[PDB]
Amino acid sequence: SQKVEKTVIKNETGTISISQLNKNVWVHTELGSFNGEAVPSNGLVLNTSKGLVLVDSSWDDKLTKELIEMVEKKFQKRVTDVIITHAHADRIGGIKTLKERGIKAHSTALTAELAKKNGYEEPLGDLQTVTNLKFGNMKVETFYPGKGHTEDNIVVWLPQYNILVGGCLVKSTSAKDLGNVADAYVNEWSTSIENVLKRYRNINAVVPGHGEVGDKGLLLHTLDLLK
Numbered sequence: 392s393q394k395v396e397k398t399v400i401k402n403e404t405g406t407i408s409i410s411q412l413n414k415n416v417w418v419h420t421e422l423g424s425f426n427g428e429a430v431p432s433n434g435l436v437l438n439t440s441k442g443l444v445l446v447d448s449s450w451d452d453k454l455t456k457e458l459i460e461m462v463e464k465k466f467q468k469r470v471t472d473v474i475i476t477h478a479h480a481d482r483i484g485g486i487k488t489l490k491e492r493g494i495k496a497h498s499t500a501l502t503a504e505l506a507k508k509n510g511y512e513e514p515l516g517d518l519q520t521v522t523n524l525k526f527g528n529m530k531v532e533t534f535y536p537g538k539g540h541t542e543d544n545i546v547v548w549l550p551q552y553n554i555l556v557g558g559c560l561v562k563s564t565s566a567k568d569l570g571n572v573a574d575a576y577v578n579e580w581s582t583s584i585e586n587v588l589k590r591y592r593n594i595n596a597v598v599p600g601h602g603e604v605g606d607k608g609l610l611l612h613t614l615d616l617l618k
């Protein structure tokens with residue numbers, strides 16, 4: 392097959408799916424059981440000319456298995472990069488699968504310090520506050536605003552489309568609050584957002600951690616959730 396005007400991929404179950412956001416920017420969101428309920432995990436996929444990329448794996452290796460099988464079907468390519476913001480089941484849940492297909496779960500040395508603490512396989516663990524990533528024909532750059540959703544949480548930036556993917560740190564507008572903050576820093580969160588929205592004052596789209604894509608407003612709204 393070829394030459395088609397279709398978008399937004401979905402699995403037989405529907406638990407996982409994607410959506411065309413930009414020329415080479417997509418937003419994938421999966422679902423993973425938790426506390427006897429369902430909890431969607433927002434994400435993002437890059438369509439480079441040297442292998443797709445994931446801004447975050449699935450909840451579990453068995454869950455991400457169906458996630459990668461999707462991107463590697465319409466993008467006539469394969470995933471060989473996995474950016475991890477923080478150490479969580481919704482970040483490195485598929486760390487096992489990433490090391491089975493030759494994929495690399497990029498992440499900061501800290502993001503791994505918590506991974507092994509949970510039982511994961513620990514990501515690459517070789518990053519810093521900021522890292523200008525470049526895959527084939529794409530431009531990306533990490534950033535560490537501060538402590539918010541996790542002790543090792545960071546936001547993703549794209550110096551070309553102005554698309555920021557804060558994640559769990561940048562809550563959506565529809566959201567009402569932050570929620571469980573057992574392993575989070577509500578006192579530092581306000582400081583983190585103030586660093587993200589400041590680092591870039593020309594964002595075109597913002598993708599939260601649990602909800603839907605929006606805009607730079609998400610950052611401003613997040614503060615309201617703390618205050």
Ligand SMILES: O=C(O)[C@H](S)c1ccccc1
Nearest residue numbers: 425430479481540559600
């Ligand atoms: O609440 C969050 O942002 C993280 S990703 C989480 C952890 C456990 C269950 C649901 C969500």
Ligand SMILES: [Zn+2]
Nearest residue numbers: 477479481559
């Ligand atoms: Zn998380």
Ligand SMILES: [Zn+2]
Nearest residue numbers: 432481559600
């Ligand atoms: Zn999340």
